């Protein structure tokens, strides 16, 4: 129910309205990422 369709199934209209919802979400959702950190050694670590 954003796009009426003459069928009782899982037709394309599902994919379409799914697009619509996530699109209007990403229109909104202004977020800023902030975070703290640990501090570890670097000589006692295998990967560089």
């Amino acid at each position: 129910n954003i796009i009426n369709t003459i069928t009782d199934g899982i037709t394309y209209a599902n994919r379409t309205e799914f697009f619509i919802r996530v699109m209007v979400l990403m229109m909104m959702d202004r977020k800023i990422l902030t975070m703290e950190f640990y501090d570890v050694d670097t000589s006692a670590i295998s990967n560089t």
């Binding site: 369709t5 003459i6 069928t7 037709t11 394309y12 209209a13």
Partner: protein, 48 residues
């Protein structure tokens, strides 16, 4: 019914008694029955 070799028993305009009769048997009135299967190809509305 024709005669023995005469023309026809409906031309002489003279009645006869002993001509020949068809007969059927017990059950010659079996009503008949047919049946059909229907399935349609293209609906009226359609297409996701």
């Amino acid at each position: 019914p024709i005669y023995t070799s005469g023309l026809q028993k409906m031309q002489s305009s003279k009645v006869s008694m002993a001509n020949v009769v068809l007969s059927a048997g017990s059950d010659v009135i079996r009503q008949a029955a047919i049946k059909y299967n229907v399935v349609r190809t293209q609906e009226i509305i359609l297409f996701e």
